[PDB]
Structures are given as C-alpha cells and as structure tokens.
Design a protein around this ligand. Sequence first.
Ligand SMILES: CC(=O)N[C@@H](Cc1ccccc1)C(=O)N[C@@H](Cc1ccc([C@@H]2CC(=O)NS2(=O)=O)cc1)C(N)=O
Length: 296
Amino acid sequence: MEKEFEQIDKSGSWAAIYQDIRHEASDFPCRVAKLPKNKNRNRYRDVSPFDHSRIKLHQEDNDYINASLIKMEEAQRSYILTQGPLPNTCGHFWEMVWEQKSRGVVMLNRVMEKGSLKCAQYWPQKEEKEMIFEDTNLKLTLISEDIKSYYTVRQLELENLTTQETREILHFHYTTWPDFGVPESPASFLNFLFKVRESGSLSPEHGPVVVHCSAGIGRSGTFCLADTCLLLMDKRKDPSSVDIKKVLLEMRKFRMGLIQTADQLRFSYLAVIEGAKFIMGDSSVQDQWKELSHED
Ligand SMILES: CC(=O)N[C@@H](Cc1ccccc1)C(=O)N[C@@H](Cc1ccc([C@@H]2CC(=O)NS2(=O)=O)cc1)C(N)=O
C-alpha cells in the first residue's frame, strides 16, 4: 500500500480512485428506513441503513434506528455505525447501546458545526443533570470526564430502569475532526484510536462499539476503515496483502457512503501506513504518537 500510495499521490489520482470506489460500491434495499413512519428517525434523507445490516431495536412499537452493523468477518471485529441521534431518537440510541451490549461510544463530530446542529446533545454534560429517556426507560449519568486538547473521554452510567441494571459506558469524543475533513495528523488520529483500543471497548467480550459522526459514514467510515485495516495486517501471514480499497468496499456492503471525500481516503492510507509501524513490531511508535498529538 505504501508503493500504491506514492504512485497515486504522484499521479494526482486520488479523486479518480475514490470515484471508482463510489461506482463499485454495493447497492442494497433500504425499505424500512424509507417507510413513511420513519421519516423523523432519519437525519438525512440520503443516508440510510441497508435492510440486511440494520440494527433492530427490541421494541414491537417500531424497531427502526438509522444504524448499521458493519461485521468484519476476517478482521474479527464488528462496529455499529449510526447517525448523530435526533432530539426524538436519543432514547432509541441508548436502547440500542443497552440491547447491543456496547461498552463504548465513539463520537467524531461536535453537536454544532459550521453554525448548524449536526447531532442532538444525547448525553449529560453535568453530573447533577442526568438524562431520563422516558420512551425507552433508560437513565444516563455523567460520572466524570477527562478532557484533552482534541478529545474528551467520559465515564457514563447507563441504567436500564426496567431491569434495575447499571452499565459503565465509555464515551470517546474527538472534538476537532471537521465535517468532510481529516484529523490534524496521523499521530493525533492514531493516538485517539489506540486510546479506544486500550480501554477494552473494542474487545470481542463486549457488544459492537457504537461509532458515529453526523451521518455516520464520513468520519465514522474513516475511523473504522483504519482500525479494520490495522487488524487485518496483524492477522495476515503477509501484512502487505492488505488492500485498503478492497477493505473499504467490504465495509460498504454493510453501510453506504463510508468515507466521504477523496482526501479522507488518502488520510486512511497515511493513518494505516503509520499505524503499521506498531503492528510490525515496534510498540515505541505509540508513545511517539502521544507526543505529536499534544493532548495536553
Ligand atoms: C435534509 C437532508 O437530508 N439533506 C440532504 C440532501 C438531500 C438529499 C435528497 C433529497 C433532499 C435533500 C443532505 O444534505 N444529506 C447530506 C448527507 C451527509 C451529511 C453529513 C456527512 C458528513 C461527512 C463526514 O466527513 N462525516 S459525516 O457526519 O458522514 C456526509 C453526508 C449530504 N448529502 O451532504
């Protein structure tokens, strides 16, 4: 992929490669997302979950949520990519986290971006102001948060009011990744991803991590593509066979539009090439990424 990257850069063909991918991308029915009754459960009329991979709420009322299960078989990791919840779907969103047994939530957007609301304020900002979602009977409380220069890690307590159970949910919020944009640098991106990895949120012992931005495809796709590619090059006899474009197409079989710009695709290569340094044997890179990320 490194020789690929150079040749692509050299030829100034990113937009061409990326466009080929959009052309080859799977096209699956999204009937349920399109039902008349779910119009208000969709943030963007053009971003919908495929029927075969959509996450189903365990409610007879209406089991719909704009969320997709990206099940990467070879990499042995699953991710749920969903849109930034709407004012009326925050209860659904947390019902999904409970039901799917997720341990962590990765937010890659801010609620307001470029003067526009891109996602509801679905978690409490103040410990004393917990949130109650009456429709799904859940309760969410902020226990503590650890704010860094470009991301914030929150410790939340989700309580299922019906069953009296409590679970700790880790919220990993990347606050400076712009819409249709790319992280500041590969190190800052990788320092964030590895933070998520180290927390244990991505382990098979837990349900799929929930990843989202505003539409749940651009930034979310980038994050997931890099993570998956890094797992692949660590599992394969030949760490060089990993084809980023092929992996992305694999992911697009579960949710549409993953990776929204040719530059986000380029950034994914950069991110994976650098991350490979850790995969291939040198753990020191991690410590180096933290320095370059300047989280303090
Ligand atoms: C109101 C609305 O849905 N507007 C639609 C346009 C539309 C489509 C069909 C009919 C009428 C209007 C709309 O803006 N959709 C958005 C969908 C969309 C929103 C946000 C992104 C973001 C890009 C990124 O890097 N991260 S992300 O949160 O996935 C990516 C895609 C768009 N196309 O930009």
